[PDB]
Amino acid sequence: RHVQWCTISHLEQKKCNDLVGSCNVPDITLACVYRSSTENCMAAIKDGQADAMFLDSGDVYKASLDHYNLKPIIAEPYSLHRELTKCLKHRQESLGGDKMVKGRYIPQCDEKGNYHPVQCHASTGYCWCVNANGEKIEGTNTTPVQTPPTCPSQVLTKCLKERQEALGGKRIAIGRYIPQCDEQGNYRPMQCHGSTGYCWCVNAIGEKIEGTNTPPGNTQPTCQSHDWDTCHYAVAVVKNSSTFQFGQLKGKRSCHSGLSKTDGWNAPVNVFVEKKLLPWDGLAKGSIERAVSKFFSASCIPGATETNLCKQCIGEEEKKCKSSHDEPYYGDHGAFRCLQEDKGDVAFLKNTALPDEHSGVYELLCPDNTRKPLNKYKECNLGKVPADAVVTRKAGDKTKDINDFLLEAQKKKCKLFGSPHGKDLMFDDSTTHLAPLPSEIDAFFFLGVKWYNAMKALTEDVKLPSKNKVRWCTINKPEMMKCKDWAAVSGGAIACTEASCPEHCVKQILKGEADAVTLDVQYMYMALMCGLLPAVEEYPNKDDFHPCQIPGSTIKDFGTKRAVALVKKSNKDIKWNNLKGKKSCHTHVGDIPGWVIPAGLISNQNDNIDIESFFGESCAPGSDTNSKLCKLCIGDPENPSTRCSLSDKEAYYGNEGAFRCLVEKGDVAFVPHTVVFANTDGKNPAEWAKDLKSEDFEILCLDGSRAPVTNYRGCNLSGLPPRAIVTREESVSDVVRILINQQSLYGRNGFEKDMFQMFSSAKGQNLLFNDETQCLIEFDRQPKDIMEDYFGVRYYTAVYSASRSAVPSELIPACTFKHCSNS
Numbered sequence: 001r002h003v004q005w006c007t008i009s010h011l012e013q014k015k016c017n018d019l020v021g022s023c024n025v026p027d028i029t030l031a032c033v034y035r036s037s038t039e040n041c042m043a044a045i046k047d048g049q050a051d052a053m054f055l056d057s058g059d060v061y062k063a064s065l066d067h068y069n070l071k072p073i074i075a076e077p078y079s080l081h082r083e084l085t086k087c088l089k090h091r092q093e094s095l096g097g098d099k100m101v102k103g104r105y106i107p108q109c110d111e112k113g114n115y116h117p118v119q120c121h122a123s124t125g126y127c128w129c130v131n132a133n134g135e136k137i138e139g140t141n142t143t144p145v146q147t148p149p150t151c152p153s154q155v156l157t158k159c160l161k162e163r164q165e166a167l168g169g170k171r172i173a174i175g176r177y178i179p180q181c182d183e184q185g186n187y188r189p190m191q192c193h194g195s196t197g198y199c200w201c202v203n204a205i206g207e208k209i210e211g212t213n214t215p216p217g218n219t220q221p222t223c224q225s226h227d228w229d230t231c232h233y234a235v236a237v238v239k240n241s242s243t244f245q246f247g248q249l250k251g252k253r254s255c256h257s258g259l260s261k262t263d264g265w266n267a268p269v270n271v272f273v274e275k276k277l278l279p280w281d282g283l284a285k286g287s288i289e290r291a292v293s294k295f296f297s298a299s300c301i302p303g304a305t306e307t308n309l310c311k312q313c314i315g316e317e318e319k320k321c322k323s324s325h326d327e328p329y330y331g332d333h334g335a336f337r338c339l340q341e342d343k344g345d346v347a348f349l350k351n352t353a354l355p356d357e358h359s360g361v362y363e364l365l366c367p368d369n370t371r372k373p374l375n376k377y378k379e380c381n382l383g384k385v386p387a388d389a390v391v392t393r394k395a396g397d398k399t400k401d402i403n404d405f406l407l408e409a410q411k412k413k414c415k416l417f418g419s420p421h422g423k424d425l426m427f428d429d430s431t432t433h434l435a436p437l438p439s440e441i442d443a444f445f446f447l448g449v450k451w452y453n454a455m456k457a458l459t460e461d462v463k464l465p466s467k468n469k470v471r472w473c474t475i476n477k478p479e480m481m482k483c484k485d486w487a488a489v490s491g492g493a494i495a496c497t498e499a500s501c502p503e504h505c506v507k508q509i510l511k512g513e514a515d516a517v518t519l520d521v522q523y524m525y526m527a528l529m530c531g532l533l534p535a536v537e538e539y540p541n542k543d544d545f546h547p548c549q550i551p552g553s554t555i556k557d558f559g560t561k562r563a564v565a566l567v568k569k570s571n572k573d574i575k576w577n578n579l580k581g582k583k584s585c586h587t588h589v590g591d592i593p594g595w596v597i598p599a600g601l602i603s604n605q606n607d608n609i610d611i612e613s614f615f616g617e618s619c620a621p622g623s624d625t626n627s628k629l630c631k632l633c634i635g636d637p638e639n640p641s642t643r644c645s646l647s648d649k650e651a652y653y654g655n656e657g658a659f660r661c662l663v664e665k666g667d668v669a670f671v672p673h674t675v676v677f678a679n680t681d682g683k684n685p686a687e688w689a690k691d692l693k694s695e696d697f698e699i700l701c702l703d704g705s706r707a708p709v710t711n712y713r714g715c716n717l718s719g720l721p722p723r724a725i726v727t728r729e730e731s732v733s734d735v736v737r738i739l740i741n742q743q744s745l746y747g748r749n750g751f752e753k754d755m756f757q758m759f760s761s762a763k764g765q766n767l768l769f770n771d772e773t774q775c776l777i778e779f780d781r782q783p784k785d786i787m788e789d790y791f792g793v794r795y796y797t798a799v800y801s802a803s804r805s806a807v808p809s810e811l812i813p814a815c816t817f818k819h820c821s822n823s
């Protein structure tokens, strides 16, 4: 296994070469490939000449475009603010679940708010070991007949971990820095070197605050406590011997980290434009680089083409003004050197490149036309900037080898983040740890929509789609065709986009390529986790059309299905809490009322034991024919095996089929509440349902009681939420207004229903909306968690344990990735 790293300079190649010799990672060999600039390395990775490089966030955006097709895979984790510990959040969510779902696991947290390594389930007496995230160590379950297990102690905090490393077996590491930790195990704001007498400030995760390093005998700056804001900040640094303010930058000499860098270009230019220091607003006034060329008299901006923007660079011959360390003024520490050597009056870089020392001739140039000390960058900056990242090809053929090497190299403490040859070679010198990013992350989700759009805005005039048009996302060709017919009559209110599946529609809406889509319940958790909201919902009640005639009216019964546990009146011995070992009948594996809801409740109350193992002998079409979930399944009256199959071949398949399994050979069936009324009172002419009576059956309540099949509203496993039309938060009002108007024309009572019908089509079934939809009802947003608000507390608890930590789609870790954005 090999990893070929692309270096952009002679100095970087020299550092990478040193790591080839010094860093011994078994199974994986590192190699270094020289190219002359950042862009030439990006092309080399696209072409397979190399596999990976570290990129500024600005270049991460540029590399994501079709010219290069690279994606970020590894980056240093950062924090926006202090958050609740995971255990305490889990405790709060589980305590906020539906109290009628009895016997649920409530985590046990310690005096620091973390998980006790031993976790136990009160109602079952089962205990197990967990990791720091409270996730069960599989295979450590112990039954109540045994003593609770012996579980390893929790992993130490970063400060205590590095304290024990610094000591390293010895009881005192003499002459070396030993971190000082508080009582929660986080870094004390003030840190001091036990031998040199120097002191400085750190944030809560131990990152040094620039401009606070203080030699002994001097007054140290005040160190802020509980600092969990670890995003990097773009800053403008100047010497205290000058006197101009930010608003007087016109005509000055400037040093920038680079033309493509976010801290050296995007952040200052963004502020120049918003403060109208630059006579520029759109691509009609030329390029941004030309406008900046008119603003400054002479600058060093590596990568620039304009002559005066390269005048101050000091690279030799072809190396001058190159995006490469061979240009001595390239990068954050090159821009600072350019100011230090008086080739510029101001340098544009980020806080992590500022001097550590408090005393000196440098200060910060704030955009509010004041100047402030180095350590006040959080209140004197040009914005938070995104993290930087290791990138590779979008195909990800080398992602695992790159991740494995860097993980092993960091474990062995290889010299990744420093070098005698120079600063910020291969990686930023400020970097302390590099971690894998979510597997589905791309530049959009890594940078965030705010910074992604801001970067795009400097390259093209982004025509923002109209708020009076709803771009509908379709998932197949017939839907696209019905949507094109809708657009033809809509007068421009409706347009169409094409995706392959509902999740890609969610992605399109997030990225501003579409505006709305109708989602099955099984996709709503991922949609809500990613930040979309229900705008309107499909109202399915055929008995009451009054909420559809008069909008906004009160709804007596939304009419969605209710999952129930159906048993016979004769079997008086069976209640909810003894279904273990009985004979269950499921419509099919994957059905929400017949499987997902029952399996969720069984898992919540029996330590995630398999619904396979929970019952005795069952019929659940979808399982393996050899399992006990198909023993009850009768294949086909016309024997071919078609047993336990997902077709009408299996006699026990579906709503009516699970009702068959109950009466024939079974004692409990998981079905919607409508199944018993549809197949009793002689409503089914078949011989098995020969005038079977509805009063012959009852439904099981979660409190151990029973009730007649008519009271499904108060004795159910869970009611399903309706299907929802989702959109972005800022677009809910427009989508609601446009859809309600379209419904007044082409709904079931539309004034123009002869021209188009929203809820039917000759092109197929359930296109765009379900064909049985009565109308769309605006979602009445309540002051609660959107998860509980949309799903209902019962469904939320039964299927998701009322938790925001489920991952039913790998898109969720990518779309919930936190960003370094500004207001």
Ligand SMILES: NC1=N[C@H]2[C@H](CO)N=C(N)N3CCC(O)(O)[C@]23N1
Binding pocket: 537, 555, 558, 721, 722, 779, 780, 781, 782, 788, 789, 790, 791, 792, 793
């Ligand atoms: N806000 C809000 N309105 C309701 C309508 C259905 O009636 N839509 C939903 N999905 N819900 C689920 C729970 C609920 O309370 O019934 C509701 N929440």
